[PDB]
Ligand binder design. Structure first.
Ligand code: MAN
Ligand code: MAN
Ligand code: MAN
Ligand code: MAN
Lengths: 222, 226
């Protein structure tokens, strides 16, 4: 039978709410929905540490003090990736608590058509994206992509590469900062992923496997 | 309609398959199923030696079981197990770390029990983090100390989100642990006060009681409705 609907996860904002239908033997049905409660963030937060606080080879050899410092702090703020696909993000928009950054972070499903998974992350099956917090230190957004078994793909052509600019701030600025260099360097993930390092904060098992990672490398260098 | 079954989560081990399904607006329905593949080292060794060498309500009947095995085993469980730490061991957020029990004067290994498969939202709705003790090579039982903590990282001694010891750990079996340490708790409709008197939370280090007297009482009238 059914079970309880949980609590609306937040009062001072907008949250999520989950139920455990919990079916029969060796099976467990759950179900999640987002809930609403009342109460100049995207364009007036990073501007405080920027506006006043101030070919493929030439790109990934750029030692800009702005770009370097920003990227450092990006990895010193962004949450980890989930070790598994948060199923409750398929049709809803889910909330995950990063145990390392000790905070709640909001995630939208980035497996849509405008993502074009067959193009950018051709190993993956699903992708998810961090969302600009109300107290976001940056305009960034953790990207994470998963496989057919729903586990995180750590290294390679389809992996969670942090995006300097999120689609919430701008889908075109993101595309021309976090994708335009990736298409310049002909899909060479090994050339891209060293400048834009994927993230495995919760330290999940490495994938694709050692042998299969290498076959990818020798194909991606041609 | 529904969606895919998805692939077994692991081949070199034992995993699951999860299925999503069209829900309502801003909802997401899902369901999980178990999957088995061959490769439980010391689980079926030290325990098996300790096992063989030893107008009516269902929840009442469970809490009315005078099994000499159950009572004897439980006594030695609350003697093998370590005390709960007063605070949250930060370094465990990944998965695992080793801390030292002052009472037992020994090291014990702990795993982070704060995942989504846990659903802290439901089973320990006060708590923010949870951790469980791990089956030591010299463990006398299949049990495991559960301890759940709060926003301020401190142990929640009483109430709906508390460290209720598990007679059977996930390491030995996830299904037998469910059907011994969770199934009666589901039976006794989320009644922590009914459950916890028979499966008593532990505060061996005698940290400050939490939640406070004021809020603990607020929990009384609420939690015995749902
Ligand atoms: C789900 O919730 C309960 C079952 O536990 C009932 O009110 C009803 O069957 C509903 O479908
Ligand atoms: C969830 O389910 C129904 C609403 O659809 C109610 O019984 C109650 O709100 C519960 O929390
Ligand atoms: C459930 O419904 C049908 C299968 O009977 C399909 O549209 C699809 O496979 C979905 O999972
Ligand atoms: C089960 O669900 C459908 C088959 O109807 C597919 O998504 C897949 O083969 C899965 O195992």
């Amino acid at each position: 039978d059914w079970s309880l609907w949980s609590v609306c996860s937040v009062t001072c904002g907008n949250g999520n709410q989950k139920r455990t239908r919990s079916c029969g033997y060796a099976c467990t049905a759950t179900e999640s929905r987002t809930c609403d409660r009342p109460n100049e963030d995207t364009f007036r937060t990073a501007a405080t540490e920027v506006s006043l606080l101030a070919s493929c080879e030439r790109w990934m050899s750029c030692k800009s003090e702005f770009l370097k410092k920003y990227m450092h702090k990006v990895m010193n703020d962004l949450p980890s990736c989930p070790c598994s696909y948060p199923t409750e993000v398929a049709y809803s928009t889910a909330d995950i608590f990063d145990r390392i950054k000790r905070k709640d972070f909001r995630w939208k499903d980035a497996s849509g058509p405008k993502e074009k998974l067959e193009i950018y992350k051709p190993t993956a099956r699903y992708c998810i994206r961090s969302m600009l917090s109300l107290e976001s230190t940056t305009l960034a957004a953790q990207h994470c992509c998963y496989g057919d078994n729903m586990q995180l793909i750590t290294r390679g052509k389809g992996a969670g590469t942090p995006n300097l600019i999120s689609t919430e701030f701008s889908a075109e600025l993101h595309y021309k900062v976090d994708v335009l260099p990736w298409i310049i360097c002909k899909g060479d993930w090994s050339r891209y992923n060293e400048a834009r390092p994927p993230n495995n904060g919760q330290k999940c098992t490495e994938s694709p496997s050692d042998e299969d990672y290498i076959k990818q490398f020798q194909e991606a260098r041609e």
